[PDB]
Design a protein around this ligand. Structure first.
Ligand SMILES: NC(=O)c1ccc[n+]([C@@H]2O[C@H](COP(=O)([O-])OP(=O)(O)OC[C@H]3O[C@@H](n4cnc5c(N)ncnc54)[C@H](OP(=O)(O)O)[C@@H]3O)[C@@H](O)[C@H]2O)c1
Ligand SMILES: O=C(N1CCOCC1)N1CCN(c2ccc(Cl)cc2)CC1
Length: 306
């Protein structure tokens, strides 16, 4: 299934998460993205930060080349890293990601984060100027659609109320799972025809660089475990399926062949209303990404949200 974005284009509601840390070789990003497409994933999420666009773009091109999919059947996202918020740096950053991926266009380009950094050392940029330059990339045909990531409600409103806005963001990609379900923001987005896309929807990869290993492991949650057994699925599948029934597009990273195939099972069953309330009962404001390196930053998004 696919959801119609607010600029007319379509986005598959299940997305492949492509991040893997440095300890993993760049060549597994190629292998696993091919397997993902083979299992039925049509939405692939990447970014400049992830240092894998060559591999991921080659995986897409390899599956166009063997006739398994057509380019228009694939929805590929890249993101504008935070060192490149100044407007004159926006289009070059995008032309860069395209050259790396060896594609003619991304389906989606995002501002990766509102926390601007110098081209831990901070920058001040007017994000409306960055956005105008995002609009120009849509007009040029470089990005079929454009959107934001890690924006809170006030930071989104700044764009939507901009004088002479040409394009609403089509989406906001934010951390979103049963421990941090972003309900209030979700309602805001729905009221504006903006799609919430969930990352770390399986509880994040627990990278010691950003995540407190003392954090509860979402996929070992007792209520999700009980629901997995009721339905004879896995706690991963309950957490993904939770997101689809709330109108959220969900990403899922996995570099394991069995779990990549398992995750597409999310289309094969449904949770009931009481199942959904039980999962709603788990919200506890736990953002796994919780670092000094973001938290003292003038435009920290989790600064609002009280
Ligand atoms: N915009 C941003 O700021 C931002 C931030 C975070 C993530 N993202 C994007 O969203 C994507 C996904 O988020 P994430 O990387 O934090 O990981 P995630 O989807 O939350 O996955 C976390 C771990 O779950 C595992 N997993 C996958 N399927 C499973 C299953 N069926 N059963 C048990 N575990 C399973 C994976 O381990 P294995 O690989 O061993 O299977 C993965 O490392 C990222 O890859 C990236 O594309 C964006
Ligand atoms: O996409 C990112 N990945 C990919 C998922 O695994 C590691 C880091 N990052 C690092 C964490 N990032 C972040 C930025 C703002 C907030 Cl509020 C939370 C996390 C920026 C993007």
């Amino acid at each position: 299934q696919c959801v119609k974005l607010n600029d007319g284009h379509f986005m598959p509601v299940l997305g492949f998460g492509t991040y893997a840390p440095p300890e993993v070789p760049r060549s597994k990003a190629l292998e696993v993205t091919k397997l993902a497409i083979e299992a039925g994933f049509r939405h692939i999420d990447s970014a400049h930060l992830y240092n894998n666009e060559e591999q991921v773009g080659l995986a897409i091109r390899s599956k166009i080349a063997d006739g398994s999919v057509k380019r228009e059947d694939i929805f590929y996202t890249s993101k504008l890293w935070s060192t490149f918020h100044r407007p004159e740096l926006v289009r070059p950053a995008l032309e860069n990601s395209l050259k790396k991926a060896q594609l003619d266009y991304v389906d989606l380009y995002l501002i990766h984060s509102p926390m601007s950094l110098k081209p831990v050392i901070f920058d001040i940029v007017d994000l409306c100027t960055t956005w105008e330059a995002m609009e120009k990339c849509k007009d040029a045909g470089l990005a079929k659609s454009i959107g934001v990531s890690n924006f809170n409600r006030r930071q989104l409103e700044m764009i939507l109320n901009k004088p002479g806005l040409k394009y609403k963001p089509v989406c906001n990609q934010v951390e979103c799972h049963p421990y941090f379900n972003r309900s209030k923001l979700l309602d805001f987005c729905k009221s504006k025809d903006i799609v919430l896309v969930a990352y770390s929807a399986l509880g994040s990869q627990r990278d010691k660089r950003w995540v407190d290993p003392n954090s509860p492991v979402l996929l070992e949650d007792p209520v999700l475990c009980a629901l997995a057994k009721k339905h004879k699925r896995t706690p991963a599948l309950i957490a993904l399926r939770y997101q689809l029934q709330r109108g959220v597009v969900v990403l899922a990273k996995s570099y394991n062949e069995q779990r990549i195939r398992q995750n597409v099972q999310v289309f094969e069953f449904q949770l009931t209303a009481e199942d959904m309330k039980a999962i709603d009962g788990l919200d506890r404001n736990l953002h796994y990404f919780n670092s000094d390196s973001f938290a003292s930053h003038p435009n920290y998004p989790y600064s609002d949200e009280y």
